[PDB]
Design a protein around this ligand. Structure first.
Ligand SMILES: CC(C)CCN1CC(c2cc(O)c(N3CC(=O)NS3(=O)=O)c(F)c2)C1
Length: 299
């Protein structure tokens, strides 16, 4: 094949964008080439109190449906990329009256992990409801028949992991859910460092929660598009390079935007994605002797 390293094509494109200061023009191309798709159900009058933001809706062809309910609607989208054997659900931070629907979805889809990338309060405004308990009291969701209990808490400098017990009162079953909370990523902002973000993604992966033997993981922030889209694009692109595909980041992002509108919301969020994909690629382990030498010489 080509003479470069596994990440060489992406790294040279990054340097060229920096030197010519072309991050804003590229972000504008992506916005202009993103097609729109029908989102009629989201706009029904009966669903107005189920949406956090009037300008952020799931498309009809990929929305997640609630089963055995009179109104099947939730502001959530299935993003499935079968070239990488990866499936995700991207969703808004639930409102006080949609927390019950959020846990019904987690149960019906056989999810093992929830990845949360926002704080409850940001710049003096509420961004998400308190949908899990912080002490030893059980938290009851009576509309859909679930209860939630805190089992364990592990607090680090820039993220926290909660283990939660989710009880289906109607079926007499419980499951253990892993709750991965990144606590230092600002709204319309970027994480502290590539190294910080990547340590977090490796913890999510090590738990097995993204593997094809579980249901899709639930990823959310406040609207479910800016920070959630950054996390999913970086993870998907790293899987594709691991399997050997020669990838074009603009092309992969446009394809993922066919499943949910607006993923990645600023030019600096796009630039951070390139940096995390390059630095992460240098961490992957494998059997190739050639690949291992590239890693040692680039550290
Ligand atoms: C022009 C206005 C009248 C439109 C009304 N809106 C849409 C809003 C919105 C969009 C977002 O993309 C985000 N996020 C930023 C990110 O970095 N992650 S996010 O949680 O998705 C957000 F917090 C809020 C506000």
């Amino acid at each position: 094949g080509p003479l470069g390293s596994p990440w060489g094509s992406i790294e040279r494109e990054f340097e060229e964008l920096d030197t010519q200061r072309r991050w804003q023009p590229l972000y504008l191309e992506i916005r202009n080439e993103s097609h729109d798709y029908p989102h009629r159900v989201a706009k029904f009058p009966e669903n107005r109190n189920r949406n956090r933001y009037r300008d952020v809706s799931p498309y009809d062809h990929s929305r997640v449906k609630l089963q055995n309910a009179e109104n099947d609607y939730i502001n959530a989208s299935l993003v499935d990329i079968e070239e990488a054997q990866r499936s995700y659900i991207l969703t808004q931070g639930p409102l006080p009256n949609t927390c019950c629907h959020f846990w019904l979805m987690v149960w019906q889809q056989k999810t093992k992990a929830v990845v949360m990338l926002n704080r409850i309060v940001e710049k003096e405004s509420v961004k998400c409801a308190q949908y899990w308990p912080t002490d030893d009291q059980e938290m009851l969701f009576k509309e859909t028949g679930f209860s939630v209990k805190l089992l364990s808490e592990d607090v680090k400098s820039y993220y926290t992991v909660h283990l939660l017990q989710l009880e289906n009162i109607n079926s007499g079953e419980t499951r253990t859910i892993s709750h991965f909370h990144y606590t230092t990523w600002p709204d319309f902002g970027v994480p502290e460092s590539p190294a910080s973000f990547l340590n977090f993604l490796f913890k999510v992966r090590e738990s097995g929660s993204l593997n094809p033997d579980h249901g899709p993981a639930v990823i959310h922030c406040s609207a479910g598009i800016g920070r959630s889209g950054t996390f999913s694009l970086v993870d998907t692109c790293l899987v594709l390079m691991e399997k050997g595909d020669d990838i074009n980041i603009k092309q992969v992002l446009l394809n993922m935007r066919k499943y949910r509108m607006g993923l990645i919301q600023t030019p600096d969020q796009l630039r951070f994605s390139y940096m995390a994909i390059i630095e992460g690629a240098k961490c992957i382990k494998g059997d190739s002797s050639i690949q291992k030498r590239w890693k040692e010489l680039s550290k």
